[model samples]
Target: SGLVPRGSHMTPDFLAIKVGGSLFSRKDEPGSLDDDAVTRFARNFARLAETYRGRMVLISGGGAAFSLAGLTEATFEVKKRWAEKLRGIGVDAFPLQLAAMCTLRNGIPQLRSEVLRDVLDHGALPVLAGDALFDEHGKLWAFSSDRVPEVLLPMVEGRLRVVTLTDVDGIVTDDTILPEVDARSPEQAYAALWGSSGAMHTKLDALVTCARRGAECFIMRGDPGSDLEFLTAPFSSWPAHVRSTRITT
Candidate 1:
């Protein structure tokens, strides 16, 4: 348990945001990045940071870009570009490579919590990406972005919150969106065939872990109409037009 600092008085409130790859590039053109979408997300994220005023970490997916090259390389490139874009918007963003900060054990990534805390203390938004890292035997290990927050939950101090921004409007079934999902019963939330790569199921599993740890979880779209106000506003005050799925334990 020494891997994670316990009872640290200086542990800062943390918000973990998972930025899906679908928001960065189009499925048809997986090789190129979408400038317009990236710019919009960066601005919205900056505003959210201003509103929250807490240490924030971003875990980004490679999107379709991973199909063009190596998984680790592509994801790192996407996150790097995103960090630069955030910087352009006057936000202090630092891209942290997962492979450099974590190692695989039994097919799971073990994070270097000390490095993460150092980055937080430096007052920069730490941007991490899913990567193909090495396992104990030096074999390849694929660590997805959805699983990052669960690993990070223990390191957070005060209030811990996780927000997943994907292309869909929460968990959808039969043309209707589920406004809320019980994390304990994730199996009833969505079908495995819903997302492109069974990603919804993976996301649900990760969220369940977070919810069990007493962290609030939310799933919503990252489209133009999406509002970031929910990050700071109370659930009751959320506008009716703002659609999202709140995950509860």
Candidate 2:
């Protein structure tokens, strides 16, 4: 594909939103999804869903929220243990199932889309997370929520916009946010995150994939107020107060 028409880049019928697990709960501490955070996100997400009803999908990331029973660090070894536990209970299934369940409590539905028709057809937002992931071989794996779009886009029947919510305002360099970034410069974007709890490397790679696929992607903070504004605002020409950055192809 050379260049997709501006409005037609992604399927106009659907928009995909990925909420970082950190938004619902803590990543380093042992706890379930934060009640307050879930409440706030649900409030705003409800508004978005109503505004763009029948045209969105919501996915979550793995924060300490999903691993309420055990301690989870951002390490492969710990992730592997989590995987084994899920498989032990239900083979080939994601073990830490609390993410989808808790989200259901807040209002978003965790739908099993066999042919990617459940969401738009029913005006339901399907929620998924990186906490419990199994590879094609049915082996548990540690994955990132930022990488979820790649797997989901192909399954769905339309073009999609990828949006990621993080704990910080956006990709920052020296404490100042970058209004826009080139997806190709993963190294610079990686350094902007400073490589720790932000999961910058994986996020950058995912954004690049989105750009290459000719879809627009945005990275922004998880604040419900500001995030909602960004979500509702037009793809470009957003107000100055919005700190989110768009990664273009």
Candidate 3:
């Protein structure tokens, strides 16, 4: 239940990395995952897991590839089928490209960070994403993957960080990118969003909530080169801005 302190760089203790489905889908197509893109991201993630061992958690967002909704026996069945297929890609096919081991811990619904911690301690990667989760009455919830960390972060008993990986650079307004944001200033943050809805706004709102809770949150592009710079750079040495946004005190 611990939170990241102010002005702290992300550590190896607990980190949640979210990958948007756009990384896997083509810009022109939008809804379909590009095979090459998916493989490339998985390779980069495999490298990340290899470097960090079990200290990081990963979540995948939907760009139409994983947008299951509603709660019926048929929909639930479809949800499970899709999740199973995604798990195979995330855990089996993709990681094997680099000869790594990973497990899809959140494919079935229900949040469980203890299981994630165990995998981390044992040098295994825990893959996650928002799937169709149901209540006792079988009501379905189409949780956004961006908010998945919100549920998982509080359950872990160590310093935690929230890192979101997307295809675009951080939040921008009037062609100027915001280097940092304070969650308390909802007006400024929402203004930075520039009245956008859908995915970008969703991510902004979720990160703002995280920042309000005192966890260091960042939005950065999804790539290995910049990722190393951001993740390894000293807190003081971080660039004024670099296609990434930080939400902090």
Candidate 4:
């Protein structure tokens, strides 16, 4: 997993972005930038940030937000081939090194998350995990931010909420973001969620764990006003039939 599933250990009142969403796809693309996309996203994201500004929140993006490319199955272990690909162009190793380096650095992260670092530095909260660290001798270890909320949430006196803001409305039905979800159960949600990456499937797996552990988690579209609207509603008032759906333990 690119991240420990439950690493988002924020408060029940936490307002967040999925981090790696469609916006990252246009980032750094010379001609495709929507220009208004960042402002649009930030406006929506920051609206929630303001309410919880004095508190902690988790804002994330897909791995591409940090680098358009990623450490996928085809890349992480393709060392010999990778080095060859970069031999003539010079690999800037620092970024790739930190791509998984929360353990060794051991400093106050300040703002950067593995993916949303820049946004965090600019005021968006960084969502991250305490992950494995490799040593100079090529050894590996394990760490988790998945349970960060497990530890950190208690510190908040129970003001936590977990929301996964993605590109589409709830799982799509007509091969598009339906205005409301026809299915709230996991199986139906999967059929409606449209993405080749299987992000919804992954979210369902996480939501099952979320249910077992008693976390209040919801999934919604990250566009325009959804974040603020979702937050303002009594957490229980979130409609079962939504452009997306809510999953609680």
Name the best candidate (by TM-score): 1
Shift in Å, residue 33, candidate 3: 2.3
lDDT for predicted candidate 1 compared with the true structure = 0.74
Q: Write the per-residue lDDT of candidate 4 for residues 1-249, one digit (tens) a residue.
A: 133133223324444334333543354553233435544555555555555553434433332132322332222322222222223233211112222433323322222233433333344343332333443444443322222233233233333465666666554555554332222345555654444445567665554455444455566666643346556456545556555555653
lDDT of 1 by residue, 119-154 (tens): 777777888888777778877767789888877866
Predictions ranked by lDDT, top down? 1, 3, 2, 4
Q: Rate the local accuracy (lDDT) of all candidates.
A: 0.74, 0.56, 0.59, 0.41
- What lDDT score is found at residue 21 in candidate 1? 84
Lowest summed lDDT window (length 10), candidate 4: 90-99
Q: In model 3, how large is the Cα lDDT of residue 70? A: 31
Error of 3 at 45 (Å): 1.8
lDDT at residue 63 of model 3 (Cα atoms): 39
Better of 1 and 2 by lDDT: 1
- Deviation from native of the Cα of residue 210 in model 3, angstroms: 1.9
lDDT by residue for model 2 (1-249), tens: 344356522234456677776666664665455655655666666566665565665666665433422322332232343334323433231222322222221222233434344444665444445544433344334456677666554544434667888877778777677777777665567676674443767887787787666557888887744457455555655666767767766
Q: In model 4, which regions exceed 4 Å deviation?
A: 1-12, 27-35, 63-124, 127-159, 172-197, 225-227, 236-242
Clashes of 4: 23
Q: What is every candidate's alpha-carbon RMSD to the true fold?
A: 5.0, 9.6, 6.9, 11.7
Specify the highest-lDDT model's number: 1
Comparison by TM-score, 1 against 4, better one: 1
> CA shift at 248, candidate 1, in angstroms?
2.0
TM-scores, one per candidate: 0.85, 0.69, 0.71, 0.50
Model 1 ranges off by over 4 Å = 1-12, 63-69, 190-197
